[PDB]
Design a protein around this ligand. Structure first.
Ligand SMILES: OC[C@H]1O[C@@H](O)[C@H](O)[C@@H](O)[C@@H]1O
Ligand SMILES: OC[C@H]1O[C@@H](O)[C@H](O)[C@@H](O)[C@@H]1O
Lengths: 480, 480
């Protein structure tokens, strides 16, 4: 057990600690950033470094009794692209057929010039392949309504229109900025004969997650836990909530009065909390986070909260730590391929280390590091690597709780009735499959100002329903 | 408005308060009663007022891979009798067909003398009625193995044998005491042609619930939350857990060595915690608890913890409070039928009051009281009745957490690997359907010695699967 290396690792682990004080600071600061993000900004939305706090123009939570003919839904995530058909049967039930295809590496590389048409043509092709397989009879004649779930920040102008503010994650297609994604997708559908497919709704994967749970949640289960947040903890991270119309100052005052006159009280907000504190006024920052933001990410200066939490970057944090330990002549990389190989270590790699056992000489960690980049390790080295992984994930889980606590506090959602509890719809590989991530989230919520009495009233529920049901719900409401 | 009556209600509600100190006292006392209950009992088991702590002779938790032909299962609960067929498909999957029939009130009356044959004859008839509907073809030829779930204290002698120690809940059939329930059921089955149906297993509904969760829990879900307790919070209350063979001193020393030699380490214990502190050394007691125990219950002196928790008695507590308030000329019963009508107020009546809202003038409370005993009430009266209900249920929920915390402490269940949690399998109408009951249970667990950090490592999961799957598992293991 090399003391020099052990002491260096323990020192790094301590930098990833998030104390109760920090959570209270970040929680309260988050609320401040929400109140400012809800003011009318007069500057380039694509360059605004504040909390976007984007109105989604969704004002009605599904009742669970919605029913209609089969709807279509397309979901472009951070890693995969999904097309599906959703049949809303009513009474919280639905029939779904979906096809999940991974996003070609061509779109995440810049060596070859990529354009919006390259992307939406491909999406149109996958849509045709889906309809041919699951709806071979009525592919060309039927009047399909499609809900488009676009997992990126969009300057929403209505339920069925909005321009891309800025790519995130691994996308850097330049010409898509400032263009209405619904039109770009509809044009490529028309250009392959699917003009009968009408994209009538545009939603974020957060908005879809919230609407999906309001429908699928049983009448009894929902009377207990009312869904108040729809959030994502996968390749990226984000969340939404219902905001009072009066507090949404970005909205046209006349439009606000119109909605109020129609009986509307709230509108869902796409917080884009991955961009929480982009200027790093209070977020923890290590030497490794700076490299990820400034060297290894596609969106330098933006989405810094995400780059400390989401699964796209957690693995890259460990890589930069090993490189730092090697630069200090403390860790031998052997014949590995970590150098000049960003993102070779993925969050999936870390999941095999999070709960590996010494009883097996940390063999799961061994195979995971060899499979990822041929990094040979000793037992004492794996013991220390596990400490780093558990430090990275714990910080991600603790920071993940801050936006949830802030929203619940600002909206006074946890104390509204006797025996009142709230549900937070969670989707994503990390929250769903990373061992202990949800457990540690609840730990941070217990340390946040809502306290353990608040954590016990919050249900972080895995929403496997999906944004497709939510997108289908928006399509069912819209006109063809 | 009557201030006198309002002041009288606030004083009664304070009597139902359970403080953090009380929870710590009862938890520590419960562990003491467990340690004593595991010792060789020195008196007639039918009169022993201590914590029964009955060995169940179940020593193996299902792996989830069990598979076999269709099994039968009969479950005599506190209110209903259900017959079902369970097909264990393996890999945590199972197919179940069941028929739930209420236990005729005829068996809960003592005006006419009732005998065991009347009860088991009826149970045998329902078994025939079940097979006729779901297995009409091979009803008489097939060699059926049946697992019998008997939700009452049984001096278990083996997996397939045991004598009734004493009835509880509404049953008061005198000649059933001291008789083997498996034989009584098998004799009446033979007498109607179902001699090919062999009752090969006898289990308590607590044991069956625990075994069911060990099977149905996925490999991933169980690696996270290991089921360590199966408890019931319905018509009655009880729970079970795995105890080390060495600590079960009441068990035959030779039998322990045989089991230990076979690789066994624990044996499930039917605590019968409804009889926790029958002598009321520390359990809260009101003038109304005494009436239920000594006048309106079938088992005076026994099951006093249950008479404060389970749903069979909660409604009767409110009745005794309203009758007392009328005797004091503080509450007008009008032309109701509460007097001389034990158990006319049910816990289901209280469920409509727990979360009734003043914004609707407590209309649910109004309709619920009229339906129960034609008790007309004013708004101010319903406001006060709701305060009483919320005090009764909270005491039941806080007391309900004590046995769970004690078992977890004595067994050191929370001392596990990283990110390891435990599951408590919960079944019953109260824990499942009474508003807020589980929410308040988790609060008391946070006040117990395990603290809020322990409640977050404990998952009270509603196991609606049932003891049928658990009984079928014991039948699959046993020989025909
Ligand atoms: O996929 C999770 C989140 O990733 C972020 O980069 C996007 O801006 C969000 O719209 C999305 O919900
Ligand atoms: O049905 C729940 C519980 O009720 C109690 O009255 C019995 O003594 C227990 O054996 C049973 O498990």
């Amino acid at each position: 057990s090399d003391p020099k290396l052990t002491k260096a690792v323990d020192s790094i682990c301590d930098q990833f600690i998030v104390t109760k004080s920090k959570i209270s600071q970040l929680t309260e600061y988050f609320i401040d950033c929400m109140e400012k993000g809800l003011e009318p900004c007069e500057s380039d939305i694509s360059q605004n470094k504040g909390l976007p706090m984007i109105p989604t123009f969704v004002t009605d939570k599904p009742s669970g009794q919605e029913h209609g003919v089969t709807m279509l839904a397309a979901d472009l995530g951070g890693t995969n692209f999904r097309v599906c058909s959703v049949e809303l049967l009513g009474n919280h039930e639905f029939k779904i057929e979906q096809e999940k295809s991974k996003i070609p590496t061509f779109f995440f590389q810049d060596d070859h010039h990529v354009t919006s048409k390259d992307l939406f043509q491909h999406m149109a092709l996958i849509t045709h392949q889906f309809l041919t397989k699951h709806h071979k009879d009525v592919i060309q004649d039927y009047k399909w309504k499609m809900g488009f779930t676009f997992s990126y920040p969009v300057d929403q102008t209505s339920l069925s229109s909005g321009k891309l503010i800025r790519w995130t994650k691994g996308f850097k297609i330049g010409d898509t900025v400032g263009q209405d994604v619904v039109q770009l997708f509809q044009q490529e559908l028309n250009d392959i004969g699917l003009s009968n497919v009408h994209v009538v709704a545009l939603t974020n994967d957060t908005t879809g997650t919230l609407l999906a749970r309001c429908y699928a949640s049983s009448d009894a289960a929902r009377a207990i836990n009312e869904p108040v947040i729809g959030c994502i903890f996968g390749t990226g991270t984000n969340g939404c909530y219902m905001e009072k119309l009066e507090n949404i100052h970005k909205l046209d005052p006349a439009s606000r009065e119109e909605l109020l006159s129609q009986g509307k009280t709230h509108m869902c907000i796409n917080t884009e909390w991955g961009s929480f504190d982009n200027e790093l006024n209070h977020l923890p920052t290590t030497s490794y986070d700076i490299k990820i933001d400034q060297q290894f990410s596609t969106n330098p200066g933006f989405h810094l909260f995400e780059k400390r939490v989401s699964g796209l970057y957690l693995g890259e944090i460990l890589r930069n730590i090993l490189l730092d330990l090697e630069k200090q002549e403390l860790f031998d990389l052997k014949e590995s391929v970590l150098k000049n190989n960003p993102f070779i270590l993925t969050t999936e790699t870390l999941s095999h280390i999070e709960i590996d056992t010494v009883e097996n000489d940390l063999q799961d960690t061994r195979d995971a590091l060899l499979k990822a980049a041929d990094l040979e390790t000793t037992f004492e080295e794996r013991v220390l690597i596990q400490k780093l992984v558990r430090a990275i994930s714990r910080r991600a889980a603790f920071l993940a709780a801050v936006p949830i606590a802030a929203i619940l506090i600002k909206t006074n959602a946890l104390n509204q009735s006797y025996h009142c509890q709230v549900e937070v719809g969670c989707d994503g590989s990390v929250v769903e499959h990373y061992p202990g991530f949800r457990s540690m989230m609840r730990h941070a919520l217990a340390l946040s100002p809502i306290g353990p009495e608040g954590e016990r009233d919050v249900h972080l529920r895995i929403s496997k329903d999906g944004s497709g049901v939510g997108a289908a719900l928006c399509a069912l409401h819209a006109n063809y």
